[PDB]
């Protein structure tokens, strides 16, 4: 995707799953790109910024996208401890 000249010779860069680090393919129609709104820490209102998580169709087939998104939300400080 980069030759010896340095030119980026590739049509596009596919995104990777946030849970399993697998490449989300072009015809993976079970893939999910979820935006989770983050809030102001004083008034608790929608600030305008958000965290984005991509889950591939295999994890969502496995039934494990729930725990994946939950542990990513604990990682990003959206869901509190315990």
């Amino acid at each position: 995707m980069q030759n010896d000249a340095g030119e980026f010779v590739d049509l596009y860069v596919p995104r990777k799953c946030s849970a399993s680090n697998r490449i989300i393919g072009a015809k993976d129609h079970a893939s999910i790109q979820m935006n989770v709104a983050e809030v102001d820490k004083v008034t608790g209102r929608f600030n305008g910024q958000f965290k984005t998580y991509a889950i591939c169709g295999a994890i969502r087939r496995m039934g494990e996208s729930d725990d994946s998104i939950l542990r990513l939300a604990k990682a990003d400080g959206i869901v509190s401890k315990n």
Partner: peptide, 17 residues
């Protein structure tokens, strides 16, 4: 408490649209 946390996470998902 986990019910409340997942409900707030779902509310965050809905508000972000």
């Amino acid at each position: 408490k986990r019910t409340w946390e997942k409900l707030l996470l779902a509310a965050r998902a809905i508000v972000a649209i």
